[PDB]
């Protein structure tokens, strides 16, 4: 489903818990493609609460498998991601998505 490749520095113990906000600094990247979305250039943390089921399954799954401070290289499959028809006008059909996240989230 999700196969992260984490990076060492950070706490590495405080996992996310259900029904709480999760700050991120995600920067999208298409598989053998280009950047399409990012928040570092936009300068906004993009707060979101886990449990309400509003973000994509792969992103929350990758966030579940990590903890505070640690960077990671998230990977997502087309079925988990948009890849049945695709997000219209930006992502093509049958996509495979990549993300990498840093955070200073509260819990």
């Amino acid at each position: 489903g999700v196969e992260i490749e984490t990076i060492s520095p950070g706490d590495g113990r405080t996992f996310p818990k259900k029904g709480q906000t999760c700050v991120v600094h995600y920067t999208g990247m298409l598989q053998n493609g280009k950047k399409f979305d990012s928040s570092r250039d936009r300068n906004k943390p993009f707060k979101f609460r886990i449990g309400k089921q509003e973000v994509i399954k792969g992103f929350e799954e990758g966030a579940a498998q990590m903890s505070l401070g640690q960077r990671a290289k998230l990977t997502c499959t087309p079925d988990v991601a948009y890849g049945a028809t695709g997000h219209p006008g930006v992502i093509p059909p049958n996509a495979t998505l990549i993300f990498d996240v840093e955070l200073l989230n509260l819990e």
């Binding site: 493609g33 280009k34 219209p88 006008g89 930006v90 992502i91 093509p92």
Partner: protein, 290 residues
């Protein structure tokens, strides 16, 4: 002129020509055509008077007659050897009038050339009105059907050098010039006038299908550009496959700003948006990114 109230008959019989209106209900409720079959004594209201025509229309009518005769001879020639394999030799007796047709196409595109924008306003408007009138006079009697038939007959071949055999080896070089000049001549007709493109909007499928060959060069492309500029009512008819054909043209013939202007004109109607073609072109073009 103006006040004659004259009558006309044969020199031999002296039998006056007049309408009679013998028609049934069907023509009576429909068109007001009155077949002026002649009979004894005519009718009391057979008086006629004369109105002279200006210089331009008579000249234009004569050019129409000459071009129609030449292009009909051309069509007859092309149809003569269309369905006929032929070996090493001449195709038939009457060869085509290649040089005359080329000079005709050059002079006709020169004739319909628009006026210089640098010229003063009033005379420019007058020349514009004259050009619009001349386009209407040409299009009413025809000359889009002849040009369409000619280019369709020519485009059965694809090589432009080899497979165009039945015309003759002498016509190997002339084919590219003929098709390019014919496309430019069609562009010269369709420019400006609303009525011409309004009539020509039916052939959207024909023109967009024709955009699949180097001989079908950018002349027809800018014809489509003019059609979309001048006849916005056709914009609703457009479907997804036409957009795919246009994008295929952009990929196949390299980068070109003219196609970009074509798509931009295609996007928005006369002061009105169109969400359908907007979403279609946005889906097809952008997210691939290649």
């Amino acid at each position: 002129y103006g006040e004659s109230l004259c009558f006309v008959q044969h020199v031999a019989s002296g039998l006056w020509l007049t309408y009679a209106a013998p028609d049934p209900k069907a023509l009576r409720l429909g068109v007001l055509k009155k077949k002026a079959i002649l009979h004894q004594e005519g009718h009391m209201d057979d008086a006629l008077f004369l109105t002279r025509c200006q210089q331009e229309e008579s000249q234009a009518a004569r050019m129409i007659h000459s071009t129609a005769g030449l292009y009909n001879q051309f069509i007859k020639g092309l149809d003569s050897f269309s369905g006929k394999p032929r070996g090493s030799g001449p195709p038939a007796g009457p060869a085509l009038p290649i040089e005359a047709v080329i000079l005709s196409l050059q002079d006709l595109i020169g004739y319909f050339e628009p006026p210089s924008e640098e010229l003063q306003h009033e005379e420019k408007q007058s020349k514009l009105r004259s050009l619009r009138n001349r386009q209407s006079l040409f299009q009413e009697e025809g000359m889009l059907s002849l040009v369409l038939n000619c280019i369709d007959r020519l485009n059965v071949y694809t090589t432009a050098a080899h497979f165009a055999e039945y015309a003759g080896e002498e016509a190997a070089e002339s084919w590219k010039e003929i098709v390019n000049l014919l496309s430019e001549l069609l562009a010269s007709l369709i420019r400006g006038n609303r009525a011409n493109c309004a009539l020509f909007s039916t052939n959207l499928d024909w023109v967009v299908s024709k955009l699949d060959r180097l001989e079908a060069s950018s002349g027809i492309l800018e014809v489509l550009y003019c059609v979309l500029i001048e006849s916005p009512e056709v914009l609703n008819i457009i479907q997804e496959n036409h957009i795919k054909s246009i994008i295929s043209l952009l990929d196949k013939h390299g980068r070109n700003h003219k196609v970009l202007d074509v798509l931009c004109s295609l996007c928005v109607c006369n002061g009105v948006a169109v969400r359908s073609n907007q979403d279609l072109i946005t889906e097809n073009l952008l997210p691939g990114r290649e």
